[model samples]
Target: DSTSDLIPAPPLSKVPLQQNFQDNQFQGKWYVVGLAGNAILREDKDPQKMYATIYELKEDKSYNVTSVLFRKKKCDYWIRTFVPGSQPGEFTLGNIKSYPGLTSYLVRVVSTNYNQHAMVFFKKVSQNREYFKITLYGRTKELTSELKENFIRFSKSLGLPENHIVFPVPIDQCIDG
Candidate 1:
């Protein structure tokens, strides 16, 4: 399995992550506010559509990710198992049955307040192929402009192209659907 080849690497910046990151507090729902990089494989014309991800802490200490996305005027769902990495705030997301040939992808929680917002980074690499994604998540449907700006700044620090940044429009109605 390619899983055995997985490695733990630092983010683009040499800076260390939050020393006291709490996984238990990190469990729960988070709304996608902003995204950067070309790693997203969405086929929708409006790739900026809103979505929410629910992180369920498993007994094994892994996370069960429930991603809810609104597409074609309906809700689409994807389930993934996030296996913790060697570091405190890192993970390898896989078990995406819907998408085969995909085993594990790197995930890192760059920062989070557990209540207000969180910044995350992800990368997938295989035999000279690589894809990276950075996302800003919020506790609510609306993210303050200042928060969005902060995400942009963080993305730039990771060498993400400014033009590639995408701020998804929030669909609060999806919460009901």
Candidate 2:
């Protein structure tokens, strides 16, 4: 599915990761507040607002991703597994069973407070051009304006186009907390 191909290769430009980022401290639940630039969710899926993206950080520096999306009055699920990359604060995310060859896209923790919110940037290269899928995560459904602005500035610092940043509508309780 094209949705599975949305992850691009390593970025063409340097994207900053939070200095001294720690997986254990960064562990826990985060709600999706924004998603930008991609066919990752697929057009056939319901509006982005109906879906929720949740991550569970593991002690081993791996994480489990459960994306619950609504369609036709039902929920469709996408569960993924990720392991730490060669470098710190970087991960390779994919579902081996669903999309075998397309595994291993880079998921870098661009910035986060480990408690309040985080800005995550996903990258992969398809057709020799880099593609990015950016997501903003908050501890709660709504982030304070200050946190949101920090996310924006972080994205801009990475050279992502202003128009590329998309704020997904927030919804609470899509899955068990």
Candidate 3:
């Protein structure tokens, strides 16, 4: 799958987490409006729209995650548990048995104001190859240019040529509360 060797690896500790992160502040619904790069989705298995993901804390400290995605234009639900990371703003998402290529996935909060918008960074392991992804999550389906620029500059550290960095077209039902 080497159209390239994947993005260069930047160790987890080196990747910055959200400044002044607090776990309680993150529980709620969010819109995944953008993604920086991928070999992900692998096409058909991908989440297509700007969809909704809900986070609710559990007793074990993990988050019970519920995601709503439009598959073939029909709504479907997928679930995952977010294992808290060693740091406040980091979380680990395990392998998806349905995704033929994903082996491991890690998500980090690059920036956020909790109620308005968040910039997230995560690395996806596809067939053992490494790739980094940048994203913007907003309380609404809309995001400000300031956060967009923040996402872009953060991706630049991963050596992304600025191509692949993009916003999915916004939508309402999957997002509007």
Cα lDDT over the full model 3: 0.75
By lDDT, is 1 or 2 better? 1
For residues 1-177, write the lDDT of model 2, one tens digit per residue. 333433333343567777777877776667787766543342434446735666677656588877886555667788887788867778886554456345337788878888878888887544444577768887777878887777777666655556656666665445434
* Residue 89 alpha-carbon offset, candidate 1, angstroms: 1.0
- For this target, which candidate reaches the highest lDDT against the unseen true structure? 1
lDDT of each: 0.76, 0.67, 0.75
Candidate 1 stretches greater than 4 Å from native: 1-16, 40-47, 96-99, 126-128
lDDT over C-alpha atoms for residue 114 of model 1? 92
Q: Write the per-residue lDDT of candidate 1 for residues 1-177, one digit (tens) a residue.
A: 242322233365643365677999998889988888655433447457779999999999899998998887878888878888879888887554445555447888888989989988887764444667788888887888998988888776666657768877777656434
Question: What root-mean-square deviation over C-alphas does model 1 reach?
Answer: 5.4
